[PDB]
Symmetry: D2
Amino acid sequence: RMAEQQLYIHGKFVAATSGKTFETINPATGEVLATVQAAGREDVDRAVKSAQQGQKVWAAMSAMARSRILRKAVDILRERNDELARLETLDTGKPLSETAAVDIVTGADVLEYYAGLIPALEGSQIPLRDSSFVYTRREPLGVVAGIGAWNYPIQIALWKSAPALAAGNAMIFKPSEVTPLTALKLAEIYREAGLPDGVFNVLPGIGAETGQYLTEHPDIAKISFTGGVASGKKVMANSAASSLKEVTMELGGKSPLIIAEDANLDLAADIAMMANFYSSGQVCTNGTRVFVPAKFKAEFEHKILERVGRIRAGDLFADDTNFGPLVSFPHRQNVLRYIESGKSEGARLLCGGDVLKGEGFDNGAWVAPTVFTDCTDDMTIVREEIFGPVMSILSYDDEAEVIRRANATEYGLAAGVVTPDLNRAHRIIHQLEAGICWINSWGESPAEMPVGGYKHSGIGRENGVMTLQSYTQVKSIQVEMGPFQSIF
Amino acid sequence: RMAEQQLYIHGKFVAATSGKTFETINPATGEVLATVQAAGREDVDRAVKSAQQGQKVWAAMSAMARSRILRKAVDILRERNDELARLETLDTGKPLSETAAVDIVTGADVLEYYAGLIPALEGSQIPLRDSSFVYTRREPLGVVAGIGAWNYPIQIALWKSAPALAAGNAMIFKPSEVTPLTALKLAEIYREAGLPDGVFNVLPGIGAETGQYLTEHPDIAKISFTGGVASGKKVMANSAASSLKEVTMELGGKSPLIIAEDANLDLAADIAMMANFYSSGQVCTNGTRVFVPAKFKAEFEHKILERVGRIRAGDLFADDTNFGPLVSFPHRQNVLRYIESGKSEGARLLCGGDVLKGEGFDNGAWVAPTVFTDCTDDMTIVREEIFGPVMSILSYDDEAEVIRRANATEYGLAAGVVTPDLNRAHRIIHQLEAGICWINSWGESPAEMPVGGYKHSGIGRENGVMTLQSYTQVKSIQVEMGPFQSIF
Amino acid sequence: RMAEQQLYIHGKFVAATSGKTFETINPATGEVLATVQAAGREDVDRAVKSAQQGQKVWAAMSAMARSRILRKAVDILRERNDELARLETLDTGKPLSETAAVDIVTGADVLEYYAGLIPALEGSQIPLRDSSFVYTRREPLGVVAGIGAWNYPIQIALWKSAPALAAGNAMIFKPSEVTPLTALKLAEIYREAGLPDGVFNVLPGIGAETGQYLTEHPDIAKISFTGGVASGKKVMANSAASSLKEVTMELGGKSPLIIAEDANLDLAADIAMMANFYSSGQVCTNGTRVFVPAKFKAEFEHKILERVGRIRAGDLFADDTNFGPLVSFPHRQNVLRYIESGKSEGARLLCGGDVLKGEGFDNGAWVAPTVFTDCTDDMTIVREEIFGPVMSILSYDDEAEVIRRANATEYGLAAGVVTPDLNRAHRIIHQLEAGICWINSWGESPAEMPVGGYKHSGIGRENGVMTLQSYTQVKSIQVEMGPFQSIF
Amino acid sequence: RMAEQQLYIHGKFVAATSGKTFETINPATGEVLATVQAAGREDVDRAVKSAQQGQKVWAAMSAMARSRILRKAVDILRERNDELARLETLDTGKPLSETAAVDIVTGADVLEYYAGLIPALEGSQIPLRDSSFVYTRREPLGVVAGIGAWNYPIQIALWKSAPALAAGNAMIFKPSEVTPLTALKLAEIYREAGLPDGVFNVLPGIGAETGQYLTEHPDIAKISFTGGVASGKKVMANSAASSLKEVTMELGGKSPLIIAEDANLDLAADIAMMANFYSSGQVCTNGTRVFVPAKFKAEFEHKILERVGRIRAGDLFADDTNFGPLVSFPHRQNVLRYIESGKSEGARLLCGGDVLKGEGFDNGAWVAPTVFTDCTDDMTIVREEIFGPVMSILSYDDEAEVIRRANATEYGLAAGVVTPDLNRAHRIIHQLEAGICWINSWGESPAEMPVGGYKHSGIGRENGVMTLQSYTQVKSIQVEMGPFQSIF
Ligand SMILES: NC(=O)C1=CN([C@@H]2O[C@H](COP(=O)(O)OP(=O)(O)OC[C@H]3O[C@@H](n4cnc5c(N)ncnc54)[C@H](OP(=O)(O)O)[C@@H]3O)[C@@H](O)[C@H]2O)C=CC1
Ligand SMILES: NC(=O)C1=CN([C@@H]2O[C@H](COP(=O)(O)OP(=O)(O)OC[C@H]3O[C@@H](n4cnc5c(N)ncnc54)[C@H](OP(=O)(O)O)[C@@H]3O)[C@@H](O)[C@H]2O)C=CC1
């Protein structure tokens, strides 16, 4: 185990006053990783007052002073990458081959990106006439709150806190109860870099209590939320009911991967694999509806089975392991229910469809890599996000049809097309109703590229210059140098 | 009386299927202006399907083709300015001296502004490496909805529809039941200008029915709302619960006007008058907390009394009338209750405070221009938006004090300072928590200037280039020209 | 003929003070179209003082006031399209089928574009610390000068004057002595639209005198030049010697057209034709080096012969005529000397190579559509711009080879590639050293798209938002609200 | 005495092939600091070939890889600040109290600024129609050249090399022959930070040879020049004659300081001192025309004289020294000729006017702080840049007059106003024809703030986001997905 984990408020660990705790489990073993204290309503109010004090200090510094501090945190994250990756692997079940290469690396990439952009954050000046002009300021929101999810815990913490801090705000961050540990480490790293006390506070807790208290607090100006559609709606409602707060949400999706009739099927199968089985399928952007031309279906299915056979489940700290258990045993039960609905609705099971068994698997939340084919647009496994390693293969006949079917969903997060043809690639992508589109690839999310969902898959965006601006609020100032005219 | 008013769906007037109607009155006389049909749930759905069809036509046109159509609508609005202003005066009670100079003039200014910006709406391109790059598209949201308020009916309709249409969307607009007439005229004008059928539909109705159906419809991508905080919270809740929607809101405020100790008091009194009694006080941005240095309070009060004596209530079509009734008898009743609370809480009534009486007033919702002084921060008239002709004068001693008291409010819409001193003007304005700040002036809202509230006064902004962009959604597209590598 | 043409200064036609005139010829007949007065040094000084006076009036107007006037000029140009096109046909020899479809249409497109962008021209604001901030203004340069070329007289006049006027400057425009007439008509149209006197003055004259006097005047802030490299070098030198002027230049090129190995040869031939024989080959961006794979060369050569045979020379006002004489007889001799160098250097002449003869041609400056093949990179016709209807076809073997050869030139204006392959199209284009690149097309120049040359083909850009900004100069203004510290 | 200084080409010091050397002097003692090799024509050719090779390596790296390398160079400059400042004091004669606080600090500030902006350098995407779109790339120019001046040697090298390198170019930098030493040190620091060989090459030499060879070289795409007007015109001419090159120029000025009638005269005098006597008056932006209201002139003269009496000339490494000799003895002779013209033209010599004498001064190029008053606009010392410690005080009567007189000059670099009045400060500044304007301050040049001259004081700008963009060239790319239509 680890010592009982405390709250982090104003540059130090402090005990919760709630009297409540929870446990986080190692999903590879079922063993308790740590007992964690849960922030109560009074603890949340403490954190907001701490953040208000720290934010004032932070915003009064020069832009380049803020940039240097965030850059030092980047340097620490690079140094402690391997230590942090192993902790993430213990908490989430994702293989170290992933966590040591992606989670902190791309989280730190976004922090490094925003650190350099702070000096470029500018207002505007508008001349109206010789005797009057307008200028604008991009002012901090003040105190903002982030609510993270459990699939990429420290990456999500960095992607929310980086633009928020770079824009001059303090952030109160609540990690998922499933994966609270790396956020507490991130808080220590920020302070070590010189972040003022209160600018990044971490309140572990339960969604129904700690998360709700944050969304209801009158002095929080913005909520940024990552999670499921059901919880996003609850969060949106409560943020409105209490104090009108700006809101950003990434809510996952059912993203389509379109294989064109002129695609190389080895490339298409490779893209489909990476779009479905990285992080054991627990990725919001996964391409879980794979549209394949009817003429290619059988050959494509063979190619998928060939690659699924190369998936190497095992010791999560082993170099060659590239597949892990799911994040929790309750989550596995939900994935298994989806798999059974696929069977009961007549989807053809091509591989997988059960838990993994044997020594080293019986005690972990393992689900075998699963592929259904002969799927149809009305099936539950095609319509609903599963967030596990479950690929659905759908046949199609013509380009206009496949565009219609890809777009006929309430989700809108990602999409992709596989084709060597110039006109086909751009033509199809431009008609797809998704915010993140990949041509002949999948999954890369550069710091420069805004990402977020259409329709029910999200509100607002993350990454890119625009997200730095979305963590400021515009103040317009008119200077009137002429004589003011009253009609009274 | 006018003929019965119908819904406007797909380029024509059409009868509602709800079987329901309401009446709009002339608030200066009590006479019924028109019987108006109310959109039902089925009428809303037809409007959404009409809008979906028209939006596709509109978005497929070239940017300059769209710009030319909106410019033709500007020309028509300029030509009919006086006719539309007279109708607005009949429906709202605002003097023709206001409506003929401001309402259509500034509504059309914003439409004209956005029409010219359509060809400048651009995405981005981000090079990643020799073998891969990203580009973004600013795509239309699709069908958006606007919900208007009754104080500036056609201006609000133009400020909401202009960026939405310019961004390639269709808008369904619901005017306040108090003031539905000019929105219907605007719909005709857009069609005359060549706007494709369905791109601007107008659904009169009640907030509890027609407005709610819009916020709940699954195929509406964004809601833009103007009104009060209480109704704003309900709109946000329904918008989230039904189908996740982008929401923008302007919700009024209690904006502070800070008179510096070196201000010319004639200028200060003139600004305060224009900040409290224009449109009979029914303006969201009004400077209803007037902070005056204690050493000049008595002289300032004298100057206010002189100018209040010049307020001219009378025939709304007479050139010298500069004060009208309130929009309705219920709204006046609410204003009168606030006035009574001021008296009962010990504020000193400097002038006004009662209904107007006599021939020409008995049938209208007229309230005398009212000024309270000796006010304190805990009083109801100081803490709550009244939305009538009620000024609160508060004394202060020092600059740090007045900034603290100006900011000690849940509202955040506007603010202003009166001072000839360079350092004082910018120094104070930069510390004020408001989205719209005026130096030595009040009320001017250029099309170029983003305007909106801090804190509980709103979400998002209107006008300026940023609001055009806010009616698009970003699609990020990565072109991967190198060979894709899978780890499976 | 026509009345003798005068100078246009301060809103009226005025006699030149030079005592000098020149003649413009109808290149289809050899007859004198008009005698035109030539601006002397005193005429230039008068135009500058007029421009200085008009610029002050123009810049004092509101941005939207400027926008409306330029939009009124657009409306007049659309209405007078056919009248202006016939005048352009008489002066240039370009077929009416071109001038009535392109010259005025696209000139007005750019004016219309910039008219709408005037209100979006904004400075910036940069906070330094609580006690100091910076804001910038985008101020007019003042009086700028444009020097036009003879191939697209009225389009060039519009592409230079539109951003200059839209940015708040006055422009003095000197058309080529070969084609002075449409610029004078434009001056009348601008005044009719409400442009203040002096904001657009037109000075016909000779390059060696009027053009040089413009480049030397101390009170002209910027020169914009279109023409050949030889004259371009003189302009930059004289502008530097006299008054440090900002200088923009578009100087033509030897643009490469790359036909890929997987290109449809009918498409390639159509693109090659439009890249070489529009406006009788007198287009700066023409793709006069056509690179074709050796394996396709014989078939491509046949397809070109088929298309050239359909070219229709004849009455320039006839609907089916699509090929005209050259702009002048001196230019034809220059074009013929180049054709002869092609013959003497061993290029294989596929068609043309001589003047056209017979009734309707003996009196005009006609050169037959001419194609050389078997060209090599050391030939005079491949290295130097001819600016007549002379296509050079070059064979190539490998992709890296064609890129090196395409880039092995001091010119850098345009380039294109023909290929259906996604990777090949973008991969090749990213490596070509040209400012204007076309994929599966040629010649389209949207107002939104910045265009200009690399290397010796120009300096700066035209069109797009950036060219509007390039006609302003930045003023940075620091407001220091804190106490200034001196070390003395 | 130091070792003979060599050229720096491709990541190492290398001997020149010119057979030529020069000496740099310590202007405080007249002694030779070092013998320095002069780059010949062949050395320039080698440096270009080195730069072409290194540029390709540098531009192929990721944006963040480049950002990290420049940030490492920042770290070394901060660490070596005092060492570099001491070298600069020895080479230039500027007091260590200046060089250790400003030269490297603000040079490194600009490098640090641009390092963070590399990831934000983006092109655009413009949709034309469903079947076609445009995107733009911001490509490196390639090899650019910077030519420095002797007053701020290492700052100028950093202000030029930072945006050029951050934009992906290689730069060949030629320092002034008066002050070559710190540029060679900077090259070593860049290599130590990981800059690829060839990306920053340094060629000491003479303007007439090394400088001219750079401006004439066909494979250099851009020249950035700092110096005097006379040499700038030569540079502009040669850049055009050889190969059409882009040119940026900062050429000094005669900047006005306008003291308003409501100004505190101690503040005005302090600003005037810092505007005239920092770096012994050798600053391009110095406010050498000080306009004072006639009614305040006598008292202002008293306050200037008192402050001049406090100037402390002496040992340049002593903490309290705040005044140094001029950079060279030839430059002192030129300054003394200007002083004599002031005397002979009837200006009243208020103080100074001679060399400093005595132990510690006879061997240095010292000129006493000099103030003239009763100046008139036609005097040589009022019209020409002196670049020494010579203030000219001019009386004025009214605001319109002083604006007219401030602007009646061919220079346009800087300007300032001293006033506590909001309207006066902005109103006056907006009318001044200068690129750099200070309100109630002088001299601060934040990295975010674009700086450069109007009129004869320069072309283009330095610092700010726009200067990063100015070191790229735009490529516009149209993708045509529809069928191309030929008229042939
Ligand atoms: N910021 C501003 O510009 C304005 C602020 N106010 C403030 O609001 C106070 C109350 O006035 P009131 O007229 O009740 O204001 P509301 O905010 O209720 O009315 C504004 C608009 O919202 C609509 N609306 C009301 N309820 C709903 C709902 N559940 N769903 C969707 N739309 C709805 C109304 O429809 P309908 O009116 O047809 O019922 C109207 O079109 C005023 O005293 C003032 O303080 C009011 C108007 C303007
Ligand atoms: N704006 C500013 O910051 C500065 C302005 N000045 C002004 O310039 C005046 C003259 O001083 P001076 O030293 O002659 O200034 P220059 O402008 O001649 O020197 C500036 C730089 O230009 C170089 N240079 C000179 N001639 C050429 C050429 N033909 N081709 C290329 N590069 C060339 C110089 O080389 P090198 O010095 O090695 O000969 C030096 O590197 C000063 O009195 C002052 O008024 C001077 C310095 C700074």
